[PDB]
Design a protein around this motif. Structure first.
Motif, mmCIF file in Angstrom:
data_model
loop_
_atom_site.group_PDB
_atom_site.id
_atom_site.type_symbol
_atom_site.label_atom_id
_atom_site.label_comp_id
_atom_site.label_asym_id
_atom_site.label_seq_id
_atom_site.Cartn_x
_atom_site.Cartn_y
_atom_site.Cartn_z
ATOM 1 N N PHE B 388 0.848 -1.187 0.000
ATOM 2 C CA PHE B 388 0.000 0.000 0.000
ATOM 3 C C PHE B 388 0.887 1.240 0.000
ATOM 4 O O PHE B 388 1.574 1.519 0.988
ATOM 5 N N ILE B 404 2.309 5.884 8.350
ATOM 6 C CA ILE B 404 0.976 5.328 8.151
ATOM 7 C C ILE B 404 0.524 5.607 6.725
ATOM 8 O O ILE B 404 0.718 6.710 6.197
ATOM 9 N N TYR B 405 -0.073 4.597 6.092
ATOM 10 C CA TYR B 405 -0.615 4.737 4.745
ATOM 11 C C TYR B 405 -1.681 5.824 4.714
ATOM 12 O O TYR B 405 -2.749 5.672 5.315
ATOM 13 N N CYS B 412 -6.113 9.683 8.724
ATOM 14 C CA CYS B 412 -6.242 8.765 9.854
ATOM 15 C C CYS B 412 -5.123 8.981 10.867
ATOM 16 O O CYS B 412 -5.372 9.358 12.018
ATOM 17 N N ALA B 416 -6.304 4.067 11.495
ATOM 18 C CA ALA B 416 -6.433 3.090 10.412
ATOM 19 C C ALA B 416 -7.901 2.872 10.035
ATOM 20 O O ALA B 416 -8.448 1.773 10.149
ATOM 21 N N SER B 418 -11.042 4.111 7.035
ATOM 22 C CA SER B 418 -11.274 3.798 5.632
ATOM 23 C C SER B 418 -10.099 4.266 4.783
ATOM 24 O O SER B 418 -9.564 5.360 4.983
ATOM 25 N N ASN B 419 -9.696 3.421 3.832
ATOM 26 C CA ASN B 419 -8.551 3.670 2.957
ATOM 27 C C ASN B 419 -7.263 3.901 3.741
ATOM 28 O O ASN B 419 -6.346 4.569 3.252
ATOM 29 N N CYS B 420 -7.180 3.360 4.954
ATOM 30 C CA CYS B 420 -6.004 3.488 5.806
ATOM 31 C C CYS B 420 -5.604 2.101 6.282
ATOM 32 O O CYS B 420 -6.368 1.447 7.000
ATOM 33 N N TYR B 421 -4.415 1.656 5.886
ATOM 34 C CA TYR B 421 -3.930 0.325 6.227
ATOM 35 C C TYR B 421 -2.447 0.427 6.565
ATOM 36 O O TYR B 421 -1.908 1.520 6.769
ATOM 37 N N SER B 422 -1.783 -0.727 6.631
ATOM 38 C CA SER B 422 -0.357 -0.777 6.910
ATOM 39 C C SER B 422 0.400 -1.025 5.618
ATOM 40 O O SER B 422 0.099 -2.006 4.917
ATOM 41 N N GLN B 425 2.640 -5.139 4.535
ATOM 42 C CA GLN B 425 1.703 -6.209 4.851
ATOM 43 C C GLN B 425 2.473 -7.440 5.310
ATOM 44 O O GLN B 425 3.304 -7.976 4.569
#
Lengths: 119, 619
Positions: B388, B404-405, B412, B416, B418-422, B425
């Protein structure tokens, strides 16, 4: 569609210091290595120094090994050549060039060149 | 005594079964129409020990077992092994051992030598190579392997040498591993008579041999003779057409070959990256640079059989020949679902958010399954990969952004949403899994080559530095033929100004101590051969551009040429033209019709005796 502009040059004196620049606008390739070449009267062109784009490898010629220095700053994407202890056989046209490491020996691009005239 | 050896002494270069081919080889052969030595016997000998340079070609037409022996040795006294081919009746064998051969090479019970020493490989071949009729034998030795030949064939009426073509069949070659510089011949005497010793010399010259489907050689050209047969091998055929053609610098043949590729002997621990205990992840990889080494790609495949060993750009089998400057090695571990996804130009998730090769990449990828190495029952989360990110990247853009993505609409920054991840992976590895999810460790070797002196090349050995002689140089892949000279050029010009569309290597950078090795052509002189076709006759002419009818002899090196070609390069019947000098024609003051366009309006024909004429193009 890219270019290599240069700046800095003129009549100098032996045993001095000079700074040559090599800038670009549309050039963004990181692995493409940079190099300098010199054209002197009588002969053709001779390689001076080379900075590899893969890492921080720098190489010089046989006569300018421990005399000149080079710095390829990727922050503003420009190359600098600091020439110290200018000898007599240094009056020549210097050109900046860029070539890909993977491929033939021919340079991919050229420059405008500056005339370094040692008194 | 000097005689003429016309088209006789051709053997088989290699031990293959090629049929209906036109193979051009470069070994030691006998030039056609060359001078040889012919002696007789009186009752001790007729000639001293002849120097054995490369090979020997012996001819004999007598019978009753007069000449049935050959001596081969360097000094025949406190030296290496010596070849002794003694032809007999009841115990005919080839005893290859160290003997004490004296000055008298008389067969007729063994008075040829004095004592014996330690022996070597000895052949027990009972088939004797013995059988008017002409007997011809070619003895040679290369790479420590003595090769014998024999073409005993019924001869015509009495003469010096018969006509026609012959090909000596390959005999039982044997490995010995010695050097020979002297040659003698054994003779048989009844009462203790005359003989015919026909000895020649073999030179390392090119040779074109045509084969047949029946299993025999029909005809062969020497390629080192008159301009007609000289140009006959440049077109790779046995017939020419009416016209003027160019040569291929085959007149002066390169005697020796120089490589001089490496300059050091220390090995390279590049295998230390392959057998590493703990590798790195795709999110944060490490690229190791190596310079001034000795690369040996033969030990790469010594490990377990890998998968998808596709090496683009270079030949996977031909890797120990080309040199480079820097060796880059970055190794990581991916999943089995993308074993073939990692490839130049192939897009995907790792080609966008991970490492990616450029368009032109001479290096090679090498991957191996490591399912038994990296596998945890609970989960192997230590090895992760960036998936990501914001947008696409470029090759060689290692990013270690531990943030943070934040490509979504709202910042965010920790929650984390919506549309927020690591970015990294963490996909785990476990033993109980399918082959599609097994971890594969892959290293991407990069062979960087710049306009710099060589630092790491193949593991080949070195050669000797030969100067002032037409040789074949292969210093840094610039395989060429010429002469190396020491010029006053202080620097080596980089032949890249006009892109060098058609430009040969004028000089090379010596891999050894700093020297100036300027390359000079051995003999070119602008030689053009006007062949009117072999169907008509066997008479051709020569043309040289850039001369004054006086400089051509000293330019084409007429002194180092065959005697048959010297007459075609004299000052007689020469004509000065606006494009050089024409030699071997008669300039007619009138013209009828242009047939062969020699050049610059000059046209030639072939009419009567039948010879080459010279005239202009009248319109």
């Amino acid at each position: 569609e890219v270019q290599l502009v240069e700046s800095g040059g003129g009549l100098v004196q032996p045993g001095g210091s000079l700074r040559l620049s090599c800038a670009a606008s549309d050039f963004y390739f990181d692995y493409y290595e940079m190099s300098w070449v010199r054209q002197a009267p009588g002969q053709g062109l001779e390689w001076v120094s080379t900075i590899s784009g893969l890492g921080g490898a720098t190489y010089y010629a046989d006569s300018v090994k421990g005399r000149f220095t080079i710095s390829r700053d990727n922050s503003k994407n420009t190359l600098y050549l600091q020439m110290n202890s200018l000898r007599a056989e240094d009056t020549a046209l210097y050109y900046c060039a860029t070539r890909s490491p993977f491929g033939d020996y021919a340079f991919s691009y050229w420059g405008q060149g500056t005339l370094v005239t040692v008194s | 005594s000097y005689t003429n050896s016309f088209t006789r002494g051709v053997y088989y270069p290699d031990k293959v079964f090629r049929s209906s081919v036109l193979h051009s080889t470069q070994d030691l052969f006998l030039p056609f129409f060359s001078n040889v030595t012919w002696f007789h016997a009186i009752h001790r000998f007729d000639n001293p020990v002849l120097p054995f340079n490369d090979g020997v070609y012996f001819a004999s037409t007598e019978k009753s077992n007069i000449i049935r022996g050959w001596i081969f040795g360097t000094t025949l006294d406190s030296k290496t092994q010596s070849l002794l081919i003694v032809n007999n009746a009841t115990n005919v064998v080839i005893k290859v051992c160290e003997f004490q051969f004296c000055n008298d090479p008389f067969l007729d019970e063994f008075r040829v030598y004095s004592s014996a020493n330690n022996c070597t490989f000895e052949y027990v071949s009972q088939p004797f190579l013995m059988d008017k009729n002409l007997r011809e034998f070619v003895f040679k030795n290369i790479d420590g392997y003595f090769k014998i030949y024999s073409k005993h064939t019924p001869i015509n009426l009495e003469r010096d040498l018969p006509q026609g073509f012959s090909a000596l069949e390959p005999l039982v070659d044997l490995p010995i591993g010695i050097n020979i510089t002297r040659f003698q011949t054994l003779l048989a005497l009844h009462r203790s008579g005359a003989a015919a010793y026909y000895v020649g010399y073999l030179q390392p010259r090119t040779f074109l041999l045509k084969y047949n489907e029946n299993g025999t050689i029909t005809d062969a050209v020497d390629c080192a003779l008159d301009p007609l047969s000289e140009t006959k091998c440049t077109l790779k055929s046995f017939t020419v057409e009416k016209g003027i053609y160019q040569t291929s610098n085959f007149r002066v043949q390169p005697t020796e070959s120089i490589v001089r590729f490496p300059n050091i002997t220390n090995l390279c621990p590049f295998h230390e990256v392959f057998n590493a205990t703990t590798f790195a992840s795709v999110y944060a990889w490490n690229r190791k640079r190596i310079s001034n080494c000795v690369a040996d790609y033969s030990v790469i495949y010594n490990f377990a059989p890998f998968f998808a060993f596709k090496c683009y750009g270079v030949s996977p089998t031909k890797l120990n020949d080309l040199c480079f400057t820097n060796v880059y090695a970055d190794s990581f571990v991916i999943r089995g679902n993308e074993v073939s996804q990692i490839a130049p130009g192939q897009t995907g998730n790792i080609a966008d958010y991970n490492y990616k090769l450029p368009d032109d990449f001479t290096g090679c990828v090498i991957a191996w399954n490591s399912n038994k190495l990296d596998s945890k029952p609970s989960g192997n989360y230590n090895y992760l990969y960036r998936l990501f990110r914001k947008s696409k990247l470029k090759p060689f853009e290692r990013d270690i952004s531990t943030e943070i993505y934040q490509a979504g609409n709202k910042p965010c920054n920790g929650v984390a949403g919506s549309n927020c991840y690591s970015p990294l992976q963490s996909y785990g590895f476990r033993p109980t899994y399918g082959v599609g999810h097994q971890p594969y460790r892959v290293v991407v070797l990069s062979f960087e080559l710049l306009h710099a002196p060589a630092t790491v090349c193949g593991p080949k050995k070195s050669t000797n530095l030969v100067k002032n002689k037409c040789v074949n140089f292969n210093f840094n892949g610039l395989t060429g033929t010429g002469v190396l000279t020491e010029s006053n050029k202080k620097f080596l010009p980089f032949q890249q100004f006009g892109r060098d569309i058609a430009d040969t290597t004028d000089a090379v950078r010596d891999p050894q101590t700093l020297e100036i090795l300027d390359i000079t052509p051995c003999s070119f002189g602008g030689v053009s051969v006007i062949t009117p076709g072999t169907n008509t006759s066997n008479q051709v002419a020569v043309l040289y551009q850039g001369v004054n009818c006086t400089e051509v002899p000293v330019a084409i090196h007429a002194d180092q040429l065959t005697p048959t070609w010297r007459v075609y390069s004299t000052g007689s019947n020469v004509f000065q033209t606006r494009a050089g000098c024409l030699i071997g024609a008669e300039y007619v003051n009138n013209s009828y019709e242009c047939d062969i366009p020699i050049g610059a309006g000059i046209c030639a024909s072939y009419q009567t005796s039948q010879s080459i004429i010279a005239y202009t193009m009248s319109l």
